């Protein structure tokens, strides 16, 4: 299961089980480029969020109901959607994943 292995490999579920996580299958530079695309408000109202002009390939990882540490279990769902990221710093790069429409 891609989700169980990647979450483990990336030090996400090595010391706990994280409910949900999203992996973007695009190039680093192509994702960083989103910080200068469509500006939109973040869920918290903040306006340093940006939406991708086009959809991107993603894999949504969600914990099943039988998941319990130390044996986390995820459900894998692939799809293509716009990603919304919050940007900060210089260079203006993504620091938070806000959502995917």
């Amino acid at each position: 299961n891609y989700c169980n292995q990647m979450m483990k490999s990336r030090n996400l579920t090595k010391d706990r089980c994280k409910p949900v996580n999203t992996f973007v299958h695009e190039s680093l530079a192509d994702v960083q480029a989103v910080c200068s695309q469509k500006n939109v408000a973040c869920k918290n109202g903040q306006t340093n969020c940006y939406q991708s002009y086009s959809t991107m390939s993603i894999t949504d990882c969600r914990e099943t109901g039988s998941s319990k540490y130390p044996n986390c279990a995820y459900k894998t769902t692939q799809a293509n959607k716009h990603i919304i990221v919050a940007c900060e710093g210089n260079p203006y790069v993504p620091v938070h994943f806000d959502a995917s429409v």
Partner: peptide, 15 residues
């Protein structure tokens, strides 16, 4: 240790 920009890539990027 790890920056917010680095954390983001490690947690969500799989190019």
């Amino acid at each position: 240790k790890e920056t917010a920009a680095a954390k983001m890539e490690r947690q969500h990027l799989d190019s």
